[PDB]
Ligand SMILES: Nc1ncnc2c1ncn2[C@@H]1O[C@H](COP(=O)(O)OC(=O)CCCC[C@@H]2SC[C@@H]3NC(=O)N[C@@H]32)[C@@H](O)[C@H]1O
């Protein structure tokens with residue numbers, strides 16, 4: 001009854017009033033490619049590592065099952081499809097989101113969305129969390145806060161799914177295309193701090209062909225980040 | 236993202252752009268009670284005796300998985316929950332649907348919806364096909380044809396699900412209450428005929444405490460019909 005017009009992403013949608021985690025459900029259940037798992041609320045939503053992702057009613061919490069028959073080296077770009085998709089959807093609602101490497105979307109430096117990609121077996125799970133009308137943690141933001149009014153959650157869903165389907169189908173054909181859309185919508189040319197053991201700072205110059213964040217340290221040394229947390233305003 | 240607020244029916248919803256049959260999928264798959272299976276269109280929709288049920292995109296084609304904890308005697312009444320639910324939803328849209336015992340809803344005697352219940356043991360599948368914006372076969376009608384304009388399919392879905400959840404919840408507590416709702420909404424006081432070998436005709440007077448159709452033959456004889464493979468028609 002939704003009448004979705006997408007080719008793959010959205011072929012099937014499994015909606016839950018409540019769930020532990022759409023990503024977890026997607027990983028442990030046999031689902032065909034393109035199936036979307038979405039829930040009004042998540043009780044065990046999660047980000048990277050052991051981080052909880054607040055998922056109260058009002059937001060858009062979903063996961064998409066993908067089976068990318070592309071080289072293994074390109075698989076790390078799936079996160080970007082999710083981030084760009086969000087950026088495009090926000091633009092449709094007159095919101096300017098900017099990507100924060102490697103999986104976040106910010107509006108005036110406030111996190112409005114996060115992406116989490118996991119690969120159980122040869123099946124890839126693209127998880128996306130976007131704040132729409134829900135309450136958010138301090139420092140974060142939502143579409144409702146940015147627009148000052150309730151936004152039809154289903155409208156955001158249709159919009160995001162439409163963008164993701166187009167981005168995914170193109171990615172399967174022209175896998176390097178997503179990098180340039182990321183570069184044009186990512187926060188660059190600024191000093192950032194890369195946390196974790198062996199923490200360092202430098203200018204986030206760009207992302208390379210593997211999607212690695214290229215950092216120029218003050219010494220001139222160039223480092224390529226594959227994973228980790230980026231901090232824009234750390235002081 | 237649908238924000239359904241029902242207690243049982245609609246706790247989960249699996250949406251299909253296309254499916255063979257929501258009833259077949261619902262009967263075959265391992266699904267929790269209350270799960271709704273809905274599709275834009277069915278390639279193999281069916282009614283009783285595997286009769287073809289036209290299911291083009293534009294109509295409401297769905298099945299609900301149920302595991303009613305009530306006496307075996309009451310199970311045959313589940314079909315009535317579907318019929319009454321449809322009638323109530325049509326009334327909300329100002330369409331006067333009337334029940335044709337025991338599984339169809341008519342508007343000015345044209346079929347606008349059909350109900351099909353299938354169940355093996357504890358698992359019961361309640362299937363409902365309702366013509367909304369789709370083209371229909373001869374002898375049928377649709378919400379769009381009755382109202383004169385495209386009808387929001389999602390609104391019809393939300394309405395039907397809300398009604399079905401309430402009716403089902405009450406059925407679990409008082410399995411007999413559904414019979415009164417059927418009586419007040421079914422076509423009675425007119426002549427009908429039971430076709431085939433041993434055929435007979437008479438006035439459809441009412442339904443008894445077992446949901447049987449009470450027919451008074453011209454001779455005054457009273458017959459109680461139990462729905463099965465019997466084909467009944469209005470004269
Ligand atoms: N609702 C929210 N909005 C903005 N920031 C939040 C937030 N909830 C938590 N945070 C913060 O963001 C951090 C998490 O950041 P990370 O970069 O590691 O992790 C992420 O940014 C990924 C989040 C992925 C969420 C989706 S929801 C659908 C699917 N099902 C799941 O279980 N997960 C995915 C936390 O440590 C918090 O400080």
Ligand SMILES: Nc1ncnc2c1ncn2[C@@H]1O[C@H](COP(=O)(O)OC(=O)CCCC[C@@H]2SC[C@@H]3NC(=O)N[C@@H]32)[C@@H](O)[C@H]1O
Pocket residue numbers: 255256257258259277279280281282283284286287288289290295296297298338339346347348349350351362363364365366371372374375376
């Ligand atoms: N779209 C339509 N609208 C009105 N009448 C139709 C129709 N398509 C076929 N018919 C006629 O209705 C008769 C079927 O009547 P019956 O009384 O036996 O059977 C019914 O009235 C039950 C129909 C149940 C349909 C739903 S759709 C969701 C679920 N998935 C399925 O595969 N089935 C269920 C056919 O023999 C046709 O003459």
